Amino acid sequence: SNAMARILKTAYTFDDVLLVPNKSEVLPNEVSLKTQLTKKIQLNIPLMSASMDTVTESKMAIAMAREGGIGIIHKNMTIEDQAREVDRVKRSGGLLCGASIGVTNDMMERVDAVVKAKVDVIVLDTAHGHSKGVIEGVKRIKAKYPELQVIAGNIATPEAVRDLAEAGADCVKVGIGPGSICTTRIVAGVGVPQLTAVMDCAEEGKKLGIPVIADGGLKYSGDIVKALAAGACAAMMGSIFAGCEEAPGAIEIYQGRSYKVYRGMGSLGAMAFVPEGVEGRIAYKGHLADTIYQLIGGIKSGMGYLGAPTLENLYENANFVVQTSAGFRESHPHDINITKEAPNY
Amino acid sequence: SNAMARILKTAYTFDDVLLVPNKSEVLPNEVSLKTQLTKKIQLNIPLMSASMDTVTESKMAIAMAREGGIGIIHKNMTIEDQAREVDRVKRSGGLLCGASIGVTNDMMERVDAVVKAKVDVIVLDTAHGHSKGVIEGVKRIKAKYPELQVIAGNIATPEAVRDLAEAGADCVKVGIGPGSICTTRIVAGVGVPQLTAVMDCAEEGKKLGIPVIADGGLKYSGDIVKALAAGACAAMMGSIFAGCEEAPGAIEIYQGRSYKVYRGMGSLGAMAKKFVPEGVEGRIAYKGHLADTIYQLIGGIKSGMGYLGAPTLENLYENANFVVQTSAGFRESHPHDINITKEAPNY
Amino acid sequence: SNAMARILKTAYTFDDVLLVPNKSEVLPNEVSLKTQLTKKIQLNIPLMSASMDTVTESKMAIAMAREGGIGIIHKNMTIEDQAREVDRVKRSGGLLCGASIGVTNDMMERVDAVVKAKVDVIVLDTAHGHSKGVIEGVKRIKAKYPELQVIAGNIATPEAVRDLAEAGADCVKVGIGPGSICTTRIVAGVGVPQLTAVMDCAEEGKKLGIPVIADGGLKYSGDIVKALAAGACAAMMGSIFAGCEEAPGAIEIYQGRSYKVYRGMGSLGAMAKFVPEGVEGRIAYKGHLADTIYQLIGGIKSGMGYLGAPTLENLYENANFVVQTSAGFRESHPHDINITKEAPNYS
Amino acid sequence: SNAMARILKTAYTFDDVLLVPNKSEVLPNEVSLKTQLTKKIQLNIPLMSASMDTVTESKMAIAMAREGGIGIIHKNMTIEDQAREVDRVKRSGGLLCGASIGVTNDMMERVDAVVKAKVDVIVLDTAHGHSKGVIEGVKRIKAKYPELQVIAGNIATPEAVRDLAEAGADCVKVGIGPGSICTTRIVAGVGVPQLTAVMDCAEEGKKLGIPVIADGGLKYSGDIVKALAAGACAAMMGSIFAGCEEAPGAIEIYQGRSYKVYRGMGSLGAMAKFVPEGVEGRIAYKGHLADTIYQLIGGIKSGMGYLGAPTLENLYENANFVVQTSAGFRESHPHDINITKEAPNYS
Numbered sequence A: 001s002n003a004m005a006r007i008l009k010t011a012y013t014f015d016d017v018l019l020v021p022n023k024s025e026v027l028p029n030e031v032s033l034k035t036q037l038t039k040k041i042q043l044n045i046p047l048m049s050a051s052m053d054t055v056t057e058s059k060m061a062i063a064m065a066r067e068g069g070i071g072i073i074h075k076n077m078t079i080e081d082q083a084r085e086v087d088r089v090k091r092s093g094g095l096l097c098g099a100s101i102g103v104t105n106d107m108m109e110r111v112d113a114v115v116k117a118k119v120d121v122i123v124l125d126t127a128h129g130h131s132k133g134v135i136e137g138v139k140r141i142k143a144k145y146p147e148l149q150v151i152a153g154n155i156a157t158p159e160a161v162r163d164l165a166e167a168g169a170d171c172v173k174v175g176i177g178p179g180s181i182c183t184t185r186i187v188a189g190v191g192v193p194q195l196t197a198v199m200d201c202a203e204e205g206k207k208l209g210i211p212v213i214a215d216g217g218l219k220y221s222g223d224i225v226k227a228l229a230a231g232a233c234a235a236m237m238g239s240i241f242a243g244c245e246e247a248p249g250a251i252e253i254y255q256g257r258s259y260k261v262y263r264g265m266g267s268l269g270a271m272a273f274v275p276e277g278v279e280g281r282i283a284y285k286g287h288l289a290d291t292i293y294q295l296i297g298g299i300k301s302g303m304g305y306l307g308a309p310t311l312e313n314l315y316e317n318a319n320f321v322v323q324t325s326a327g328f329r330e331s332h333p334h335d336i337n338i339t340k341e342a343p344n345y
Numbered sequence B: 001s002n003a004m005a006r007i008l009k010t011a012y013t014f015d016d017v018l019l020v021p022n023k024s025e026v027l028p029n030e031v032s033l034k035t036q037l038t039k040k041i042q043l044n045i046p047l048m049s050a051s052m053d054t055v056t057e058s059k060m061a062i063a064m065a066r067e068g069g070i071g072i073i074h075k076n077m078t079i080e081d082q083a084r085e086v087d088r089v090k091r092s093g094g095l096l097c098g099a100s101i102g103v104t105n106d107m108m109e110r111v112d113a114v115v116k117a118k119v120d121v122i123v124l125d126t127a128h129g130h131s132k133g134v135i136e137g138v139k140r141i142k143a144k145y146p147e148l149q150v151i152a153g154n155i156a157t158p159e160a161v162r163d164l165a166e167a168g169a170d171c172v173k174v175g176i177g178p179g180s181i182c183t184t185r186i187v188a189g190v191g192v193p194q195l196t197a198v199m200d201c202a203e204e205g206k207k208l209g210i211p212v213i214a215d216g217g218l219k220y221s222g223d224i225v226k227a228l229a230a231g232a233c234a235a236m237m238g239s240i241f242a243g244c245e246e247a248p249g250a251i252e253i254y255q256g257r258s259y260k261v262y263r264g265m266g267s268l269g270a271m272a273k274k275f276v277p278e279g280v281e282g283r284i285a286y287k288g289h290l291a292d293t294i295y296q297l298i299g300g301i302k303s304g305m306g307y308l309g310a311p312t313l314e315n316l317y318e319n320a321n322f323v324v325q326t327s328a329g330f331r332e333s334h335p336h337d338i339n340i341t342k343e344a345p346n347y
Numbered sequence C, D: 001s002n003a004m005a006r007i008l009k010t011a012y013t014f015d016d017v018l019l020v021p022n023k024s025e026v027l028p029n030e031v032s033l034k035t036q037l038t039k040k041i042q043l044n045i046p047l048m049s050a051s052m053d054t055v056t057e058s059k060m061a062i063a064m065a066r067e068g069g070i071g072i073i074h075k076n077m078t079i080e081d082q083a084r085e086v087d088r089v090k091r092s093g094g095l096l097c098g099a100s101i102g103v104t105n106d107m108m109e110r111v112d113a114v115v116k117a118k119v120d121v122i123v124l125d126t127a128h129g130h131s132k133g134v135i136e137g138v139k140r141i142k143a144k145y146p147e148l149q150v151i152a153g154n155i156a157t158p159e160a161v162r163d164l165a166e167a168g169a170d171c172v173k174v175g176i177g178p179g180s181i182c183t184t185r186i187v188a189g190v191g192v193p194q195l196t197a198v199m200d201c202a203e204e205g206k207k208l209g210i211p212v213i214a215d216g217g218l219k220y221s222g223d224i225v226k227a228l229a230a231g232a233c234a235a236m237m238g239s240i241f242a243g244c245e246e247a248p249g250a251i252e253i254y255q256g257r258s259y260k261v262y263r264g265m266g267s268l269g270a271m272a273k274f275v276p277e278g279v280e281g282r283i284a285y286k287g288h289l290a291d292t293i294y295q296l297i298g299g300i301k302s303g304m305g306y307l308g309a310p311t312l313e314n315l316y317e318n319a320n321f322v323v324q325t326s327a328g329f330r331e332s333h334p335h336d337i338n339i340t341k342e343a344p345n346y347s
């Protein structure tokens, strides 16, 4: 019968597209970066640190919150260690704080402890958010804690946005495969290029009043611009934050150069089922505050180019063009022996 | 006249596409990997070791069958030598076994011997399966041994699926050019990118009740998933298995590292054990025992079937939707902007 | 509502396209390269040196004018210093000179000084040309100096051409993100591949009788040919001229080879003299401007010969592009040859 | 007006495409490679060596003729020397011989000399063949020698095929910018990807009974199959033949590896014997012509087996191309193999 594999379309990631400049009466230092992570939760800047054991513990979540973003404490620890980490962030001046929850046996026990520590939002994320286990997990949590803010992921299709919204999620996280340390697309063959994924999911989210998060695959400040212009309410990153002194792990020096170890939570190292992540070393980047300053400067630039004083205006006025490989070469610095370090390239 | 060359379409290979997640009720450890290699032969996993002199002999084929797959013992040996390798596998517990056959004038005598040795399926293996020799060779074999199971190949179009099924083949092997050791596309200009060829051939084979094998160019566990979602009943690999301890060939040490020889059957070297070569010779990293390699493959497939909500291989096919990515989406899919230090065992 | 992000089309850069040869009655030595930079300023060759502190000061602007083109004195210096740079050009004969102007608190003060120093054209130069500040800046400058020739940039859309034209610009400069040293596309995600931007803008400009400049991203002479065939009246280059002796800066030697420093005006170092939108580095030292210009002019004249165009307007009216793939791109540059002699116009 | 630049289409080169296998009744040892270079000149194999001073003088033309092809003696030498080169080939047993002619003030004198030496075919060779000079030159030549076989080029559009045919060309040479040593597309921005060029032009040639030659950009035997399947009567190669002992220039050796010099006729080096339109470098020494021809022919015969073509006309009338991505390209070459043994037809 007609039941058979189909090739549906071409899907794009951030490097495939550029934003067209609009006429503008706004300069970069006049724009506002506030966003609604959920209906109840507002962020001053639309950035989140990933809930990985190499990216976000309390030290990182504290620095994120004071920069106007938010950090999701990772769940690769005891329930009580994670509640202690959430309690350390909240005791640092009432800062926003998130906590990652997995679909497990102790899932409700973990939620209780991070709820007792007064976590502001829990992220129920799985390899595959469009599942029975996640859907039934969100219903279970919201039945107990109707006011607790719940982000569910990861997903990559508007049907999954709709299904996760019917389950009670207050926000939905987008990204199957784009992770810099992710091999899910290589080992299972599954994933959606992240620009198409975010655009289609945000469009459906907008129909329902449910925001979407662009999770994974972001390398430069410009990628973040594209993701918010595609419709994400916020951008979540591991690689971009994992080289920072505030992320867990010590700054190791090898051959006179400083490194931090960054790894996927599906890697063999994090899990000490077939691995879906790798483990490696990135260059130490310094303090989170200097990275955030370049990221925020890049976003304010992009909105100035597009004439958008708010993130809503950026979405409603974003037009992409697709570029080829040859346009990719043109869009990056070329035919130049770059010497001096650039703080955002 | 209108008789002139044409550009028909764009054709895709595995790295061109990704599978879209589906709403899923089933977890990876719940799924069934069982498949029908032919109407009469079931495999416990849909994996097959290629019929090459650097991949499959009796040690490789025994290990494959023990893991739920099957090995096709190669023909680069005398007839009695190939019959004895088959019977070495069949005397190891009745394990399933295969043997490749060529379009030759000693063809029936080679078939005679492997069948007496209780082979389970022969593979009529030609550079060009959609040809008069293969079609007529399948008929002769089926007329002398109507029960014997015949895979025919290699081919790349639906018309070839149809002509080989009319000729009596129980299964057709798809793949012209994709092999890691293959220069057919470079020296003859001829091939079909493997994902489009599998999709097109599987669609015809399902109208006829004839399975198709995806042979060649598989590099990663996820590629197998795409080849199965595209409609193949099984995947056949050389490169993925050729480093394993149970492949023929001595371990070779170069500058303190371990490698095994891996070479195309159309390479100058394989042909000595006259036509221009259509393969290369080289060394491949030693991959340990076969078991370690199949484990990762199997886990990667199961992972893919959870992502698509598929408890059968059939269900995976009826619900598989592919999305095309660019070279930049390819760069996003693989790990990027990290200096990998520890070894990832399925990457 | 319908208010959301859209993907409009695919846009192309110079390396995506090739010009198709036309039937031709003219050989390269017969074509004319004269161009109208504005309806008041004629250039003998359609080439400009960018307004960067590593490309154009008095010395480069003098050499460019003498070759038939023009230089734009940069503005990373005091007002009196830039006016003094302009006057030295104007005092070296009847020589054309340009000067760049920012949207600054002292904009009119800087315009007054270069006008008093007899500048021929000013370039109102910003990262984002389609902007209130540039539009009102053009209107003020043209209200005070109605005869002064004003170029306004940088922009990348027909709507920007039209709004700059109605604000009074005599010419608009096209290029958002294609510069060799630019990171605008990486840092802001914003840009338009330069071939599509030049074609779209030049078509709009031609309806108004306002010309456009192709600024940035030009690496080879053939790139300039495609920029002019797409409708630009002139081509602006930083990288191509920044290795020349006439550019500012000393020659540097590293590991036995000659270089010059080259850096974007939005780089950290340029602004030392807001997050950066350019990088800083070194390019090969190319020798004197005269030999580089000879190569560029020769390549342009050869392009017009292939296209049967004795004038630049004829080039535009007869230009036809095909899109090439990645594989075509490798066909177009020398391939499968270990190049051993330096050619004056390649690598 | 509507007179403006246009983007006509996407155009393909050989690596963009693969040929689809056809049902075949013919094996590679059963096909025939005979071809008509013009109405009067038959070739036993469809191969020509390029008219360059690193590829073809009398030594190369003698060896090509003996192999069944033809060599085009270059014109970067005096009129008398080129006649004697042609004469040396004709007195080696009446072997087939061509000679190159340019659009020069002495072109009829050059034609006179090589005709007296009994050349079989003239190549009016010029950077841009779709030009008054070449149209008028072919008219002058055919008026004085109505029976002299005349090839003219180089061109890249069906319009050019028509215009040269009306002028009396017996065969047309297709290729603008695809040569291994060509920089025309880089310095002038002008060219057409070679597969599209040959397909369009051959189709136009077939309406006229005028054949086309695929000149340039061929790297493997498989590329020749695509060029003939696209409708070229013959393939012309520089790079593939410049490494042989029979090409002019000595066999050098550096660090144990032997090599020859190879350069464009538009390179600085060749012209000292307008800005350059080629590069100069070195390629691997390949040995004697006979060993290279054998591989090329085996590859072509293999391709025709795959496509079921007993003849080149059959190949053309049954050729169906599929377009492949960048990722299809990597699947098509060998991949993930450390090649240890050099193959006669792949490196």
Ligand SMILES: CC(C)(NC(=O)Nc1ccc(Cl)cc1)c1cccc(C(=N)NO)c1
Binding pocket: A126, A127, A128, A131, A154, A177, A184, A265, A266, A267, A273, A274, A275, A276, A277, B024, B026, B027, B028, B303, B304, B306, B307
């Ligand atoms: C455990 C492991 C290695 N794999 C899976 O759990 N696979 C998987 C799960 C459910 C289904 Cl239905 C299909 C596949 C993992 C661990 C941590 C994170 C991920 C990950 N891919 N995040 O995005 C994966």
Ligand SMILES: CC(C)(NC(=O)Nc1ccc(Cl)cc1)c1cccc(C(=N)NO)c1
Binding pocket: B126, B127, B128, B131, B154, B184, B265, B266, B267, B275, B276, B277, B278, B279, D024, D026, D027, D028, D302, D303, D305, D306
């Ligand atoms: C012998 C050789 C080098 N080539 C051919 O037999 N060519 C070939 C055969 C028939 C036709 Cl009609 C066209 C071409 C070979 C040997 C072993 C395997 C292969 C191979 N490509 N298998 O997939 C090829």
Ligand SMILES: CC(C)(NC(=O)Nc1ccc(Cl)cc1)c1cccc(C(=N)NO)c1
Binding pocket: A024, A026, A027, A028, A300, A301, A302, A304, A305, C126, C127, C128, C131, C154, C184, C265, C266, C267, C274, C275, C276, C277, C278
């Ligand atoms: C200062 C800096 C770094 N950036 C901006 O001014 N950004 C910017 C300005 C306005 C708007 Cl609305 C959006 C972004 C700069 C300096 C010199 C040249 C450039 C450059 N990209 N020219 O083309 C940029």
Ligand SMILES: CC(C)(NC(=O)Nc1ccc(Cl)cc1)c1cccc(C(=N)NO)c1
Binding pocket: C024, C026, C027, C028, C302, C303, C305, C306, D126, D127, D128, D131, D154, D184, D265, D266, D267, D274, D275, D276, D277
């Ligand atoms: C001399 C030189 C460098 N260039 C030209 O003569 N250019 C050229 C001639 C006429 C026209 Cl209308 C347009 C361009 C050359 C010499 C030898 C071969 C070639 C070459 N590209 N052959 O294919 C070119």
Ligand SMILES: O=c1[nH]cnc2c1ncn2[C@@H]1O[C@H](COP(=O)(O)O)[C@@H](O)[C@H]1O
Binding pocket: A050, A051, A052, A154, A175, A177, A178, A179, A180, A181, A182, A183, A184, A215, A216, A217, A218, A236, A237, A238, A239, A240, A263, A264, A265, A266, A267, A276, A277, A278
């Ligand atoms: O092991 C893994 N496999 C797949 N995805 C992962 C894994 N670990 C983290 N991720 C995802 O990748 C994101 C980080 O991606 P990055 O910003 O590109 O480095 C995280 O927020 C997770 O969503």
Ligand SMILES: O=c1[nH]cnc2c1ncn2[C@@H]1O[C@H](COP(=O)(O)O)[C@@H](O)[C@H]1O
Binding pocket: B050, B051, B052, B154, B175, B177, B178, B179, B180, B181, B182, B183, B184, B215, B216, B217, B218, B236, B237, B238, B239, B240, B263, B264, B265, B266, B267, B278, B279, B280
């Ligand atoms: O010499 C050859 N030329 C072309 N194809 C070959 C040759 N040898 C083996 N093959 C095919 O390529 C496959 C090996 O695939 P691999 O897994 O990509 O290494 C085998 O299953 C054969 O179908």
Ligand SMILES: O=c1[nH]cnc2c1ncn2[C@@H]1O[C@H](COP(=O)(O)O)[C@@H](O)[C@H]1O
Binding pocket: C050, C051, C052, C154, C175, C177, C178, C179, C180, C181, C182, C183, C184, C215, C216, C217, C218, C236, C237, C238, C239, C240, C263, C264, C265, C266, C267, C277, C278, C279
């Ligand atoms: O810092 C920068 N950021 C972005 N664009 C720049 C910057 N500096 C110069 N440009 C542009 O790049 C052009 C030079 O480009 P190039 O010829 O490709 O090197 C200049 O004329 C400017 O239009």
Ligand SMILES: O=c1[nH]cnc2c1ncn2[C@@H]1O[C@H](COP(=O)(O)O)[C@@H](O)[C@H]1O
Binding pocket: D050, D051, D052, D154, D175, D177, D178, D179, D180, D181, D182, D183, D184, D215, D216, D217, D218, D236, D237, D238, D239, D240, D263, D264, D265, D266, D267, D277, D278, D279
């Ligand atoms: O200097 C040059 N510029 C451009 N094309 C050239 C030049 N010299 C030779 N050619 C062409 O390139 C062809 C050789 O192509 P190849 O086989 O790819 O090396 C010759 O047949 C000529 O048509």
Ligand SMILES: [K+]
Binding pocket: A330, A331, A332, A333, A334, C177, C178, C179, C180, C181, C182, C183, C184, C185
């Ligand atoms: K750039």
Ligand SMILES: [K+]
Binding pocket: C331, C332, C333, C334, C335, D177, D178, D179, D180, D181, D182, D183, D184, D185
């Ligand atoms: K070339």
Ligand SMILES: [Mg+2]
Binding pocket: A245, A287
């Ligand atoms: Mg510190």
